[PDB]
Design an enzyme around this catalytic site. Structure first.
Site, PDB file in Angstrom:
ATOM      1  N   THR D  12       0.851  -1.221   0.000  1.00  0.00           N
ATOM      2  CA  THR D  12       0.000   0.000   0.000  1.00  0.00           C
ATOM      3  C   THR D  12       0.881   1.264   0.000  1.00  0.00           C
ATOM      4  OG1 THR D  12      -1.820  -1.266   0.904  1.00  0.00           O
ATOM      5  CG2 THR D  12      -1.835   1.172   1.317  1.00  0.00           C
ATOM      6  N   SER D  42       2.025  -8.255  -0.731  1.00  0.00           N
ATOM      7  CA  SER D  42       2.874  -9.060   0.150  1.00  0.00           C
ATOM      8  C   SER D  42       2.178 -10.358   0.610  1.00  0.00           C
ATOM      9  CB  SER D  42       3.403  -8.191   1.327  1.00  0.00           C
ATOM     10  OG  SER D  42       2.477  -8.130   2.407  1.00  0.00           O
ATOM     11  N   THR D  75       2.246  -4.585   4.243  1.00  0.00           N
ATOM     12  CA  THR D  75       2.170  -4.867   5.711  1.00  0.00           C
ATOM     13  C   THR D  75       1.881  -6.320   6.033  1.00  0.00           C
ATOM     14  OG1 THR D  75      -0.121  -4.229   5.594  1.00  0.00           O
ATOM     15  CG2 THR D  75       1.467  -2.569   6.251  1.00  0.00           C
ATOM     16  N   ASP D  76       1.132  -7.031   5.178  1.00  0.00           N
ATOM     17  CA  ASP D  76       0.657  -8.398   5.483  1.00  0.00           C
ATOM     18  C   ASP D  76       1.738  -9.362   5.893  1.00  0.00           C
ATOM     19  OD1 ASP D  76      -1.667  -7.100   4.419  1.00  0.00           O
ATOM     20  OD2 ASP D  76      -2.437  -9.053   3.832  1.00  0.00           O
TER      21      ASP D  76
HETATM   22  N1  LIG Z   1      -2.289  -6.421   0.286  1.00  0.00           N
HETATM   23  C1  LIG Z   1      -1.434  -5.731   1.261  1.00  0.00           C
HETATM   24  C2  LIG Z   1      -1.736  -4.238   1.308  1.00  0.00           C
HETATM   25  C3  LIG Z   1      -1.798  -3.735   2.763  1.00  0.00           C
HETATM   26  C4  LIG Z   1      -0.833  -2.621   3.152  1.00  0.00           C
HETATM   27  O1  LIG Z   1       0.383  -2.676   2.680  1.00  0.00           O
HETATM   28  O2  LIG Z   1      -1.295  -1.686   3.971  1.00  0.00           O
HETATM   29  C5  LIG Z   1       0.057  -5.978   1.001  1.00  0.00           C
HETATM   30  O3  LIG Z   1       0.742  -5.657  -0.104  1.00  0.00           O
HETATM   31  O4  LIG Z   1       0.569  -6.526   2.040  1.00  0.00           O
END
Ligand SMILES: N[C@H](CCC(=O)O)C(=O)O
Ligand SMILES: N[C@H](CCC(=O)O)C(=O)O
Ligand SMILES: N[C@H](CCC(=O)O)C(=O)O
Ligand SMILES: N[C@H](CCC(=O)O)C(=O)O
Lengths: 312, 314, 315, 312
Positions: D12, D42, D75-76
């Site tokens: 994100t 991620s 973040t994941d």
């Molecule tokens: N799908 C999540 C997006 C969440 C985020 O990075 O806030 C990622 O790339 O881990």
């Protein structure tokens, strides 16, 4: 088996010989002996009482018959006592302060296992050089920044920076090490300290006036801890009094009542450089008072005191 | 169609001119019909009892207007928690009242005030907010104005309650998980309409080696009640107890709070004999919140037993 | 004149012993209630079955319907205490107090927590403030909602936490309330243990780096009617797993997105995955094990994914 | 000015040159260049992505003109990448992993300040020797035990053992040090790892069966992380399958989904010595998977794996 001395001072956790015989499992983990240093409710502790304890800890830490020290303490000012000993005991023999939220007579009383844990920690090699520790709730907490944060509950003692470890079935598990100066590496030593300067605390809130600050200075305060709102913020009604007090030589140390995390930043809410004031960093008001009183046995320079608040 | 929300500005880092605060969040127009008033422009650490009353009285006027569906107050963080509790006690309205601030100014990198302000207007315009008491909407949370407190410095998650958030606000939508249990707003016995002045109430800190000096000085300089911010379960040094007995006989209410603010509460008769001394315990309320409740309560009573009931119900 | 409280014992560290020994262990219970006991089972809670939940739920319902019972305590292992408490919160149509309690230490250990936790469970079960509040958990001097309390801390007596906070505390046997439940429970639930004779099979699969569709497919192959996805982040799903979940949904298996991000927030519909296009369900704030209980109970009534989502938003 | 390199992996928070352009204040505090190592969500990260990143980090750490490294990450699985790097990167040059909870186009987006703080920490001499760090919400968190614990909000990342510091106005304030082995004192080195062993995770819950455990081993798992109830508990319906998999060469590691504090104690809930199983100590299932993959590049002895789970 390590030789551990239990110093009894009072508190809800408590005749120290009884206290010990009431936990026979202690004989398994250490050779224990007890001393009654004092018998007080910790909310009523005096600076005389804190010095007396500081001195007796120091005599025992120098003894070769002594490998570790446990202090049994009331909860109310446990955190103050623990921070004090962390600044003035220049030893790397383990020092553990421990209390209880429930009296030994109550249902599911927490003191027995707390005292076992404290003895276990005071007898452990891993405790050497770590500074003063508090061992309640199966936690190894830093004496520096642990505070009584929750009332009633056995998890009362918390740090913004977390527990350093855990103690379970008498074994210590470490996850973090201290970053701030303590004990062996402190510039303060109870052996050179026979007295403590008067330091008092005034609270900040809506519609606060200069009254408490002036009165505490009139009755002898050599420093005031300002327990401000937010980031040590000072009322426009109080700033002029603090400036006049600093001019009369009273140190002005900005703390806060915002105690779960963060710190007070120099020059953010107030012009500390211009006023020659000190920020307490992350230390809550009671802790800021203990470091101020110890620091002022050595220096009255506001720039040295700010260094001290940033290193300890 | 859209809810009519009024934004009352008092100052703080969130404004660090109400018309530019509002221009600075264009998306407000999607969710409500909004207008602004500057009630005052202060640093909240410097707020007075005259400022509280002025604000409380403006809010009540707007709550009584049929052209007002909900009210947002923008406020400095430092005493936000005091204002929010005050309004929760004296505003006898089911209309949403939301108090909001920011930890960074609007010009700072990753400033928190724009979303906080959008979320406060969304919450003030939501039917689910009615009857809930005063709310604070920072960090995507709906917090109770009673027991939220500034508990973390610097970080945007600065405002926390011992009893948790009641909900969250995400993409302008409110999600509720808890309801208030204590008396507030429409079910309050207090009413800003009938309050023309507030009694002086002060706070003194308890610590190792504390003396009776601040307690006596604050009483000598007009305090009608002293909030004792004690160690532990509101404990009082044996050195200070005689002063607090002499003050209570002189008519000063003695309210035992604590500086032990993350959870639990101060139990009557545990650390001190309250019944014997005619003292009051502040239950879970931290010292600054105990002061607000004492001040409002003493507009109506000086009976220590009624004060105790009020500290157990609000 | 004292309240009638029945203790239903199921096992756990709190009994590390018959219900008669638990009662005898707390002689002060006689001061606050007329206590009676029943041994429902003697299990380690990590080994509980759906048949054990049904059995316990029907015992609770018969006792709640009894005019001679004012409150109910269940003694239980900590490991799946949160799952039992939420299940009873959904299916027990009584305003009578139901309290679930456990201990972290056995009764012979130093500073054992069990005695006071059981005293407080009986106190809360005996208190008229507990009526109409849904299923409660009374550990660590707290009153926690059975809906969203979870075992969150190992070893320590403060093991049980909710993202939405405790609702009250119990001190010296007295109850002190600060919040109320918002979500549907007990007397206002659309579910009733009286109408439930079996529970649909529901299983859980974990999301992590390099995860594949293996566990999801094996669990569906061995009878899962619903899969709880314990996603990273906002119930996120690996591009390697999405195809399999589309096919399982196409074949009748409900797909519910929960997360292993359990200290706060919730999983937002259509944010990480197109739930509307996929006909999937988000578990809102419910952790994977709680979402499995709600899914199980909900599918005794509906197989409609939009009704399932409404349920996940109201309970 | 320190030379810092930003490796973009997606998330994100986010091409890397528009990321950097986005924060013009960066030039004030370091000399920054970007590389786009990959562009993934991620949640969909593979073992091959981890290895490619880890190798690229190790080449930059060896370069004379790189003083510190920032990885921008979704973040994941940020906590899995951060731990992995903490175990395999033998450098005491700062490595900082950073993400955002909101996109840069959102009201009150967190990514700009998080990226600034990351670069500031990456350029600070205080960051040398500390292990991999994560710098969101103004905190300095350990890559070892920081985890995405809160959905939606910007305080998403927490550790059971607390933040080690804070970053404020680009300056680093330290309160704790790491205790566990990392980077320069790690027995692991990304230079020697060509591919990682396959490790999978199975969830424990009421009425769980052996199905997931069996299917994951049948499909190539060399170790199974059991995400147990409580203190890593195992259902009596699952134990026999796990004894059978261990006998066929599959490591059995007991983690839990009790992730806010405490740890899993050897031999408490299950006879690990008798079964030749390992406990994950305080590490959550996804972290215990990272450590199991790394450990298994070196040893298949369960007693050595248990040592590793107690030192890292
Ligand atoms: N799908 C999540 C997006 C969440 C985020 O990075 O806030 C990622 O790339 O881990
Ligand atoms: N009077 C308090 C008792 C509190 C306690 O020890 O739990 C003291 O000695 O601090
Ligand atoms: N002076 C402080 C600023 C704090 C803030 O709003 O972040 C106040 O107005 O309360
Ligand atoms: N076997 C575990 C014991 C854990 C406990 O009750 O503390 C259970 O029955 O859930």
């Amino acid at each position: 088996l390590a030789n551990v001395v239990i110093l009894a001072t009072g508190g809800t956790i408590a005749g120290v010989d009884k206290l010990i015989a009431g936990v026979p499992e202690l004989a398994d983990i250490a050779n224990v002996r007890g001393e009654q240093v004092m018998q007080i409710a910790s909310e009523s502790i005096s600076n005389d009482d804190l010095l007396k304890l500081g001195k007796r800890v120091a005599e025992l830490a120098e003894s070769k018959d002594v490998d570790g020290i446990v202090i049994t303490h009331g909860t109310d000012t446990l955190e103050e006592t623990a921070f004090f000993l962390n600044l003035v005991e220049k030893t790397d023999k383990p020092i553990v302060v421990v209390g209880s939220m429930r009296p030994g007579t109550a249902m599911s009383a927490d003191g027995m296992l707390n005292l076992y844990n404290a003895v276990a920690v005071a007898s452990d090699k891993q405790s050497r050089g770590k500074g003063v520790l508090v061992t309640m709730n199966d936690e190894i907490q830093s004496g520096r920044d642990v505070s009584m944060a929750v009332n009633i509950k056995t998890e009362a003692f918390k740090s913004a920076w977390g527990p350093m470890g855990m103690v379970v079935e008498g074994k210590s598990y470490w996850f973090r090490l201290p970053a701030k100066r303590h004990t062996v590496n402190s510039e303060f030593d109870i052996k050179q300290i026979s007295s403590l300067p008067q330091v008092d605390i005034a609270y900040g809130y809506g519609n606060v006036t200069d009254t408490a600050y002036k009165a505490l200075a009139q009755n002898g305060a050599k420093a005031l801890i300002h327990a401000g709102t937010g980031n040590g913020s000072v009322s426009s009604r109080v700033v002029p009094a603090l400036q006049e007090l600093r001019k009369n030589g009273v140190q002005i140390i900005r703390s806060s009542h915002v105690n779960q995390g963060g710190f007070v930043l120099r020059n953010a809410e107030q012009p500390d450089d211009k006023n020659d004031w000190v920020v307490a960093h992350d230390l809550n008001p009671q802790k800021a008072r203990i470091l101020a009183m110890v620091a002022m046995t050595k220096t009255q320079d506001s720039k040295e005191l700010q260094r001290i608040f940033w290193e300890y």
